[PDB]
Design a protein around this nucleic acid. Structure first.
Ligand code: ANP
Ligand code: ANP
Ligand code: MG
Ligand code: MG
Lengths: 341, 341
DNA sequence: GGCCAGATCTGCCGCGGAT
DNA sequence: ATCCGCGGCAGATCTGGCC
């Protein structure tokens, strides 16, 4: 796509009226507590994204109605997106008519690279496994249905199994029915995902990076549930299934959650986001818009040049931070208002 | 006190043999993956602290012998500490004779400021309570004993309650004593930790900081237990007690886990660590050594000027980062070795 | 060698936002 | 009105430290 115009009314501490991004790479500079995060967050929400914060904290102090408006231009045709926050919830108007948030799933959208994306690379097992589930669900709508259906059957089987025992064969059949499909989809996705991550991180650094998926029921879910009946009966839980897998990111053959430093995990997080951005371009046909917050804070001079040189080949990108990249147009944010010369 | 010497043998990527820090304020400059965090972590461990990492990941790749040696000088007299990490575990020598690790708890020690101290401010409900508990436990052992006793008594009471009902009145009285002592000690500590925090944060920024503790059994544990009898019986869990408190950090009157930016959160975390350092120095008699990692990574010029101006008045402190503070001695780390001008 | 502290992990229940 | 995805809380297994 190509963003044309952004307009807001009483969104967080913002005090602007209109913002027109230029084509190609851009920049934003400022001091602490000025509103770079607020502006990027508003641009992300205007195109149909998600935010960690609740909708009651996204309105100005003492008001009840926020309004965001953005205009985009694609080959298909021009669009106008209207958002209206408040107490009842969101209200989206695509081109002038009320419509649900789900219909925007087909549009390219945007990609937001933020500091909290770094806590999945070096986080606990649950968080690492949860990161992959919501990434595959962005490309296939069938994966989410299977993932939601498997959980109900697992819970019912475990609840029955806590009560001594019964003819629980049917729940075993259902669990085996869903787990095999889930595992096959995961393998199929990672087979495509690994080479792009390998060849993207090789342009920002030197060492190689990879993935390893440790499976528990790889040969068969039912043939693994039959092989652990005594221990499962004694313990009272289902100990085998896709809900117990492991994902680890490797740096030169070592786990990244125990050996990697901070400026070395930041590059892995950015490479993961950039590899996701590339695949969505082939899936949709038009690459999304890239938004990066604090692009070069925790990195040294060698890495910053590589990031800045990679980011300049994209159709459109916006970087924000305390310092101005050299050679690119620069805006400024002062107490919520954006002004450019 | 003072730190006079530091020597190692096969501790992570470090390859130095001796390192002598000058009195006053020092610095360390390096690129990514050079050994700044490793050096600070080694000093912190050698002086008698605790490290988040595991003891099997702290040894050089391919060996099972780690050695840490440090020489200090207290007002009473000089000391000498040595460490040895291997398969059996940690081993500590004090002037040539073995001693348990609990003995070093009386010595002043050190204070470490790290990026994962920022998760307490912006973290969930339980993490802030855990931070408060482990902060209070560094000034008294009665708190630890009461915590353990109360936890065990509550676990037994819940186990009994989940299976029908019995003479619970014998179990309400034992829990009430520990709960009352715990809440009294918490109030006593927070009545003194707040003015110091406000005064310290008033020198690094402009806004105001505060603390708020919300209690479910302020009037009395027995009264609340009697009041919530029907709910406890129906749900099956004790819904009232010191294990259900809130700690909220306020910036100009609003909670910091929602209405706050990155720089303000960093300043809050640093102010909390400095307040703990000052209180601990008052408690023992000699302020502990201060170690700061990436002091000024995500701050503007004014905030890090203020931080440097404050740190210039300490008996001994060491700062590390990608850049140097103007006007202080510096040392450079390359490939794991340290060379001073 | 043995057993108590104590932080880490996994499944269950109730709550908040969309269709 | 109802399913969906989620934050908060309690419980059990593990490894390492002290007697
Ligand atoms: N809903 C809101 N209404 C009004 N002010 C708000 C709101 N949310 C946040 N703020 C204020 O906005 C400021 C921080 O905004 P923010 O967008 O994070 O700045 P920033 O560009 O991110 N600075 P930085 O710390 O470098 O990231 C603070 O003064 C907050 O109190
Ligand atoms: N057990 C180990 N044995 C040998 N090398 C190790 C070990 N653990 C980590 N390393 C190396 O140490 C590097 C990072 O060291 P580190 O001390 O974090 O540097 P740093 O000063 O923190 N650089 P920065 O990324 O800015 O924090 C890793 O990239 C590894 O190459
Ligand atoms: Mg921000
Ligand atoms: Mg580091």
């Amino acid at each position: 796509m190509r963003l044309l115009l952004f307009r807001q009314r009483n969104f967080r501490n913002l005090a602007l009226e209109a913002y027109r991004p230029p084509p190609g790479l851009s920049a934003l500079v400022g001091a602490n507590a000025q509103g770079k995060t607020s502006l990027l967050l508003g641009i992300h929400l205007a195109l149909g994204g998600e935010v960690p914060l609740g909708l009651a904290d996204l309105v100005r102090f003492g008001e009840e109605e926020a309004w965001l408006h953005a205009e985009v231009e694609t080959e298909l045709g021009a669009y106008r997106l209207e958002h209206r926050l408040g107490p009842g919830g969101r209200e989206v108007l695509l081109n002038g008519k009320r419509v649900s948030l789900r219909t925007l799933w087909e549009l390219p959208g945007s990609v937001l690279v933020s500091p909290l994306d770094l806590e999945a690379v070096l986080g606990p097992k649950e968080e690492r496994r949860a990161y992959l589930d919501r990434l595959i669900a962005r490309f296939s709508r069938r994966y989410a249905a299977l993932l939601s259906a498997y959980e109900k059957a697992l819970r019912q089987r475990n609840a029955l199994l806590k009560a001594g025992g019964e003819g629980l064969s049917a729940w075993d059949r259902e669990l085996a029915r869903y787990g095999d499909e889930i595992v096959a989809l995961r393998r199929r996705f990672l087979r495509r995902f690994a080479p792009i991550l390998r060849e993207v991180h090789a342009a920002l650094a030197a060492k190689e990076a990879g993935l390893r998926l440790e499976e528990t029921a790889g040969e068969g879910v039912l043939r693994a549930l039959e092989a652990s009946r005594a221990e499962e009966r004694e313990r009272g839980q289902t100990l085998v299934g896709p809900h117990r897998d492991d994902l680890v990111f490797l740096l030169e053959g070592r786990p990244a959650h125990r050996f990697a430093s901070r400026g070395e995990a930041k590059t892995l997080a950015l490479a993961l986001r950039l590899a996701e951005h590339r695949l969505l371009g082939e899936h949709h046909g038009e690459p999304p818009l890239l938004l990066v917050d604090e692009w070069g804070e925790e990195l040294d001079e060698a890495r910053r040049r590589a990031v800045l040189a990679y980011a300049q080949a994209l159709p459109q990108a916006i970087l924000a931070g305390l310092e101005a990249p050299p050679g690119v147009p620069v805006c400024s944010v002062v107490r919520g208002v954006v002004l450019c010369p």
